[PDB]
Write a protein that binds this ligand. Structure first.
Ligand SMILES: Nc1ncnc2c1ncn2[C@@H]1O[C@H](COP(=O)(O)OP(=O)(O)OP(=O)(O)O)[C@@H](O)[C@H]1O
Ligand SMILES: Nc1ncnc2c1ncn2[C@@H]1O[C@H](COP(=O)(O)OP(=O)(O)OP(=O)(O)O)[C@@H](O)[C@H]1O
Ligand SMILES: Nc1ncnc2c1ncn2[C@@H]1O[C@H](COP(=O)(O)OP(=O)(O)OP(=O)(O)O)[C@@H](O)[C@H]1O
Ligand SMILES: Nc1ncnc2c1ncn2[C@@H]1O[C@H](COP(=O)(O)OP(=O)(O)OP(=O)(O)O)[C@@H](O)[C@H]1O
Lengths: 37, 529, 427
């Protein structure tokens, strides 16, 4: 009964979903800053 | 607040003295003197011996006598992992704290104990399986290069416990690595006394031990008991004492009126000795009850002569000092009583270790297995201050058969080499051997290994036969007077075992047809001296 | 609600008494007294014996007697795995809960039970030299380190079962480790009576058992039966009785006419005892019909003399106490009827155990196979209070041939050693 072995591993970047689009909220702050001005 | 008596270890004064002297002596001296000399500190301890003699207890206690961190324990092969390059990471994780606190606090740090358990499971010899098993050649290298490598450490201590000290790597035992090597062996009488005192102190403080139990008797009567066996004996006695009150006939109920008079009597100790605990390097009353099946009866003069010669041999081996190894050969015709006399001679020596190497327990073995069994028994016999061994019915131990002739050569060579190998210095051994064919043994040049010979004779007179019958007590009154009339006027040549068989065979006839058939059987066997 | 009468174990009073005294005696005494002694608890049990005598039953009843947690079970070698260090992970996963609870609660933790089944398939002698070995070494080392190591557990109990008690490691059987060893063997008359009373208590409750059957007779007519056969006998009798009430055999239905009068009679018991059940430590009446093919004919004087001599030897080997072992050799010319006379002498002795070791079941075997077969037969013979073994055609066993001569030395030595080895005491 030959046995006792090993292995190697790899990975994958699964969080492909973009996030930059929802982070460009600056313009709304600019408009409300103008309102407060 | 450390006090030796608190440790609770008995029978190991010298070993602890040496461990303290070598390992913890340069850490308990004023720093200036220890620095002027310019000496480093020891970095290991190894402990090996037979099972049950108190290794792990010593490591556990050494782990509590140091005002240091909490020791890290590795339980056997607890580090192996299936992925590539994870076992070495597990091994490297153990020294991280030591390396970090050495690189900052300089020469003011504190010990970092590490305890390997069953070290022979992950540290076997290198280059032993064609590069090892793949993971047993990098683990060893990592351990070697981290205990003592290019970067220097001075604040660690490694303790290892093992049962087989021959499989460990050689490069791991040099004086720069695990260096202090000790052996934990069986105790002697004054060790057993201390062990019993340690394990019986608590009971004798609350008056739960009945005055009548004397510890000297127990110390004397337990030969070659380990520590574990003594603990088990005490525990079994306590359990027997407890069980008298409880009742389990129909439903468990604990009596609470007699529970206030609990006391452990000596009868419990005797019963536990008789029935429960069996040692491993001692002797019992079962081999002798199996070999000396019908006792021994004095039917004549020679019987006493044989025993006296055996006693002289035993005395010589016990006292003298030039010759620590003596052997003797008992020989005679078949059906004569050779094994019974050997067992009787051995049992009345009071040696602690007594074994019987017999062919009854090697049915179907090849010759390699026979060699291994013989070697193992003789290896066991070398770890006691006095030993006796018996070799039984040699001609069956070589597979001798007149045709050819045929026999085994490996076993013969092992025997011829094992009768001239003296034991480790200071210990004494006795070897007895029985055979029924002296001329064949002579032809093989096996009568020079043995130092002396004894002859076991047959029954060869009418008076001796009648005395044997009288001792056994089967034919009485008129019957005897018949045999005396018939047998005295001739000579006889018969063995004792065959005599028992003949008497038993004769006793099956009718009440008035016994003596005639007995005489017919006695005549038909034929003497042919 | 526990009481011994509902466990359902018969013929094992002494073994259970000893087990209870040694193992559970200190867990039921008041805790103050046990604290004023400083004694640790026992940590294992080992059970061994022939197959079919009640090992697993006892462990199951012990497991479901205590108020402990539901016991773990390991069904053979189900821990082994083909990757590196995957067996030891499974070995370590068993003792986790005990460690956690011991660390948390202290001396108030409950009992944890682990049950190893067929323990000789994992724990084997470790070895001495750098040869053979395997995963056994690592598994055994891990088990040994876990049971008794540098951390003290006081709330476990381990039970082991095995048929071959000569293979297990020695370091695993010292006091402190599995130190209670018990042997479960064939029962005696009272044991059979108790078992037969246990296994027919329901039927008698509903008046389903006829009035003819007398248990004290079946307790006498069944010699060297084990429990697993004293159960099968009753089951076969019940099956016969039930099948007697089905006339629609080609179809499948019930008459529903005399089922009210369903009852088990003695005839079913006798028929089942004579047809279905065949014990394994007893006498079977098929050999004597294959070795005596034409019966014994009294053609002269010598036949009676030979039979008388056999009778005398048989009588001697049963009443004497100095000689618990006897032997005899029947010899003569070829074509004279030796095997038939030996078989007829053996059949008329009424020994509970009888067996025949002939060489026509060993065609093509080498030396070692013959040695093992002979040794097995004698080993089986050593487990009955009386026995009788027949060894026929000695010269065919040794493989003798005048040219040469040639023969087998190993078989000869095995036979010469077995001819003068007394059995255990009393047999
Ligand atoms: N000198 C001693 N004094 C008191 N108790 C002892 C002594 N030696 C052994 N014991 C007892 O032995 C048990 C501890 O045994 P230990 O763990 O040292 O076994 P070991 O032989 O080193 O291990 P193993 O044989 O399983 O590899 C405890 O019961 C301890 O009381
Ligand atoms: N005085 C005696 N000397 C020796 N044996 C005796 C004596 N009295 C009784 N016996 C019994 O006689 C038997 C002696 O037979 P034993 O076992 O020594 O056979 P043996 O000489 O080795 O035979 P074998 O020829 O088979 O090797 C034992 O039962 C022993 O108890
Ligand atoms: N002493 C007994 N009293 C009552 N019934 C018994 C007894 N011994 C065995 N039996 C019955 O026989 C069955 C035998 O099964 P059990 O699991 O006990 O056998 P075993 O001998 O442990 O098994 P194996 O030989 O395969 O290891 C039990 O389930 C029970 O039905
Ligand atoms: N009085 C008798 N004694 C023996 N066998 C008899 C007698 N009467 C009839 N027979 C039959 O004679 C046959 C004897 O053959 P059997 O096999 O016993 O011979 P054997 O002595 O073993 O032969 P072999 O010399 O070939 O080994 C059997 O069928 C046996 O039933």
């Amino acid at each position: 009964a030959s046995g006792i072995i090993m292995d190697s591993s790899i990975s994958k970047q699964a969080l492909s979903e973009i996030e930059t689009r929802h982070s460009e909220i600056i313009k709304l702050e600019n408009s409300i800053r103008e309102l407060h001005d | 607040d450390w006090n030796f008596e608190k440790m609770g270890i008995g029978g190991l004064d010298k070993e602890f003295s040496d461990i303290f002297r070598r390992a913890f002596a340069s850490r308990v001296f004023p720093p200036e003197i220890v620095e002027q000399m310019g000496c480093k500190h020891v970095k290991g301890i190894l402990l090996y011996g037979p099972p049950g003699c108190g290794k792990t207890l010593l490591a556990r206690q050494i782990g509590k006598m140091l005002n240091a961190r909490e020791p890290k324990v590795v339980n056997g092969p607890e580090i192996l992992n299936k992925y590539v390059g994870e076992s070495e990471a597990n091994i490297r994780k153990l020294f991280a704290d030591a390396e970090e606190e050495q690189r900052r606090l300089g020469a003011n740090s504190g010990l970092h104990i590490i305890i390997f358990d069953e070290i022979d499971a992950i540290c076997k010899q290198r280059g032993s399986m064609a590069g090892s098993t793949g993971v047993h050649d990098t683990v060893v290298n990592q351990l070697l290069s981290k205990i003592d490598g290019v970067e220097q450490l001075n604040n660690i201590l490694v303790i290892g416990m093992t049962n087989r000290p021959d499989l460990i790597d050689e490069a791991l035992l040099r004086p720069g690595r695990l260096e202090v090597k000790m052996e934990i062996g069986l105790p002697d009488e004054k060790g057993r006394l201390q062990i019993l005192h340690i394990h019986t102190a608590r009971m004798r403080g609350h008056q739960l031990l009945s005055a009548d139990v004397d510890i000297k008797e127990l110390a004397v009567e337990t030969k070659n008991f380990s520590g574990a066996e003594l603990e088990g004996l005490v525990r079994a006695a306590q359990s027997t004492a407890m069980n008298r009150h409880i009742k389990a006939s129909t439903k468990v109920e604990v009596d609470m009126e007699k529970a206030e008079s609990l006391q452990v009597t000596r009868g419990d100790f005797l019963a536990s000795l008789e029935n429960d605990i069996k040692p491993a390097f001692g002797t019992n009353q079962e081999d002798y009850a199996s070999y000396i099946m019908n006792g021994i009866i004095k039917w004549g003069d020679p019987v006493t002569r044989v025993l006296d010669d055996g006693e002289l041999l035993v005395q010589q081996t016990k006292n003298s000092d030039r010759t620590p190894l003596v052997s003797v050969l008992l020989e005679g015709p078949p059906h004569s009583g050779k094994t019974a006399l050997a067992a009787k001679i051995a049992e009345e020596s009071n040696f602690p270790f007594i074994k019987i190497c017999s062919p009854d327990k090697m049915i179907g073995f090849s010759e390699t297995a026979k060699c291994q069994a013989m070697k193992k028994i003789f290896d066991d016999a070398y770890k006691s201050q006095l030993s006796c061994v018996v070799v039984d019915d040699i001609e069956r131990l070589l597979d001798y058969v007149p045709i050819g002739p045929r026999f085994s050569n490996l076993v013969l060579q092992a025997l011829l080499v094992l009768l001239k190998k003296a034991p480790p210095q200071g210990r004494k051994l006795l070897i007895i051997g029985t055979t029924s064919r002296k001329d064949v043994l002579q032809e093989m040049e096996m009568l020079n290994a043995f130092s002396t010979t004894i002859h076991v004779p047959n029954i060869a007179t009418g008076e001796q036969l009648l005395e044997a019958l009288e001792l056994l007590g089967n034919f009485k009154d008129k019957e005897r007077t018949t045999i005396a009339q018939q047998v005295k006027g001739k000579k006889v040549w018969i063995g004792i075992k065959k005599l028992l068989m003949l008497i038993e065979m004769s006793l099956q006839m009718d009440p008035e047809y016994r003596v005639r058939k007995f005489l017919a059987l006695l005549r038909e066997e034929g003497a042919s001296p």
